[PDB]
């Protein structure tokens, strides 16, 4: 439990120092993904083939 | 009865719960799926390569 508390303090302080929002850090690291072929990916494939 | 002084001055300091700060509004670029050109059968030239 103290390890979790100190981990939460370090991360939140880092995010404020680096000016990274909670949503931004989630988008950078989460494994959850939409599963849909986005237009960015579709354009990448069409120019790549 | 209404918690006032003899002069009518109130005896309890009130509160209002200050409005919640300014608001941040952002804009984003949007992309859509884009296709490419097609190829037709070619003509036979009269000249060499």
Let me know if A30 is exposed, middle or buried by CB neighbors in 10 A (0-12, 13-18, 19+): exposed
Q: What is the DSSP letter of A37?
A: -
Pull the structure tokens for residue B43.
């003509």
Inter-chain residue contact A43 with B36, CB threshold 8 Å: no
Contact partners, residue A40, CB within 8 Å, separation at least 6: B31
**Nearest-CA residue of chain B relative to A41?**
B33
Question: ∠ CA(A9), CA(A15), CA(A17), 5° rounding?
Answer: 100
Q: How far apart are CA B4 and CA A28, in angstroms?
A: 59
The token duo for A33 is 């993904």
What residues of A are in contact with residue B38 (Cβ under 8 Å)? none
Q: Best residue in A24, A27, A36, A46 to probe B by mutation, most B CBs within 10 Å? A: A46
The residue with tokens 């988008």 is: A27
Distance from the Cα of A2 to chain B's closest Cα (Å) equals: 32
Kindly provide the residue ranges of all beta strands, DSSP E only, lying in B2-45, ordered along the sequence. Answer: none
Resolution in A: 3.1
CA distances to A21, B17, B42 from A17, in Å: 11, 29, 62
Residue matched to tokens 């918690």 = B3
Technique of determination: X-ray
């Amino acid at each position: 439990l103290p390890r979790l508390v100190i981990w939460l303090y370090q991360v939140t302080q880092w995010l404020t120092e680096a000016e990274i929002t909670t949503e931004a850090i989630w988008l950078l690291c989460t494994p959850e993904f939409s599963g849909n072929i986005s237009p960015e990916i579709s354009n990448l494939l069409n120019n790549l083939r | 009865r209404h918690n006032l002084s003899i002069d009518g001055q109130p005896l309890s300091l009130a509160i209002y719960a200050e409005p919640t700060d300014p608001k941040a509004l952002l804009t984003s670029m949007v992309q859509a799926s884009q296709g490419g050109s097609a190829v037709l059968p070619g003509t036979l030239s009269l000249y060499r390569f």
